[PDB]
Every structure is written in C-alpha cells, then in structure tokens.
Amino acid sequence: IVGGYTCGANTVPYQVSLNSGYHFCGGSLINSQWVVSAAHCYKSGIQVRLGEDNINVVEGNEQFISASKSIVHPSYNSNTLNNDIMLIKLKSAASLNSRVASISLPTSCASAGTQCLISGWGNTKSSGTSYPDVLKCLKAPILSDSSCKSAYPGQITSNMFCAGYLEGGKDSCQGDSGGPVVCSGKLQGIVSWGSGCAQKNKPGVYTKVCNYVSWIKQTIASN
Ligand SMILES: N=C(N)c1ccc(/C=N/NC(=O)c2cccnc2)cc1
Ligand SMILES: [Ca+2]
Hints:
This protein is mainly beta. It folds into 2 domains: 1-12 and 103-210, Thrombin, subunit H; 13-102 and 211-222, Trypsin-like serine proteases (Thrombin, subunit H, Beta Barrel). It is 7% helix and 32% strand.
C-alpha cells in the first residue's frame, strides 16, 4: 500500500496473509473455512495466516492453517486478468473472535464514489521498494467505470473496477495482490492489477466481487 497508514494490530480482522515460506499475497476470510483471494495468487503449498499484524513476529493472535484445496475461477484468464478470483479452503476451521472474523459478501454491487478500505503488506513505495512488516491501510473511493476505462483503454472488463486517486500517490501495490477492498462492511473488491503503483492516471484495478457471489456460494456449498 502506497500513501496509506498503519492500520493498527488486528483492526482488519478478515485480512489474511498467504504464506509459502514467506508472505506472497493477501486474502479475505469469508467464513470459518474459506478465504477469497486473486486467481493470480494461485500456487500449491499455501499456508493461510490469520490474526496477523507484524508478519515477521509472532505476536499472540495468529492462527496458521494449511490450505486443503484451492479453486481458481473456471473462467480466469491470466493474460487479461479477467475473472481474477480464487477460493481457498482451510484444512481446519478458524476459531472466530474479535481479531479473526469473516467479512460479509455483497448483496449488490457498489457505486462509484463509495469509500472503501484497502489493506495489505505490499510495497509502500511508488518509485523504489520497501515492504512493511505491519498491515497497511488506505481509504479510497470507487471510480466511475468511464474514468476507469479511460485510464486503461481496452483492458477494463465488466468484472473489474477502479478505485483510488487519479492524481496518484495513494494506491495498492505489489504484495497487496489478492487482498480486500471493503466498502460499507462488504467485500466489494480484490487487489488485482495496475500499471506501476500510485502513478498519475493509473488507479488500482480490482476484481468486482459482487459478480461472483453466486459462484462463491455454490462452490462453498459443494466443497
Ligand atoms: N497499482 C496497483 N493497484 C497494483 C499494481 C500491481 C499489482 C501487482 N503487482 N505484482 C507484481 O508487480 C509482480 C508480482 C510477482 C512477480 N512479478 C511482479 C497490484 C496492484
Ligand atoms: Ca505475526
């Protein structure tokens, strides 16, 4: 997260770190057994880390639970990043409490102008490289589909939205991939892609979660 703020320990209780020997992606806990992330975060041997603040120090509220299965969206295209969504099932159910909690799925899509909270352990620099140890947060508005498409001609599908600031300076970044965009208490987005980070006229692009609620529910119901 570039141009954000320190969230505070366990203030984002649905935020997960996906670990394969090291943090490599974010995710969002949606019930005791399931995490939503980006399809581009897919890999084998995932351990889901819940209750994290400093990802390099055991602080007392962690739950580390191995993934039993991953399900990439049936229509994920890794070239265009269309349908950039994946479900991860935990080998055992998380113990849910104030600091480890699920986030509600949307029942309708969010509109341009809605404020959202985007979070993760990704790069904090727009030019160079610096990875934080503690969770970073950014409050950002959803942008109009027209401004999103203008920013990224020929690249924005109906399964994507832009959020952030056309002026630059405030954005998600590398390492935030797969993490949450939460608006009025609903998971509306997943950190998906962008051109660099926090660049002028290049806002973050996010998977449009409201499109996938039917698929998520039915997938969970049979797996
Ligand atoms: N501007 C954003 N909101 C944004 C931009 C990019 C990303 C994702 N980056 N991932 C990478 O670079 C990468 C990752 C692994 C290997 N090689 C390159 C997320 C958000
Ligand atoms: Ca920790």
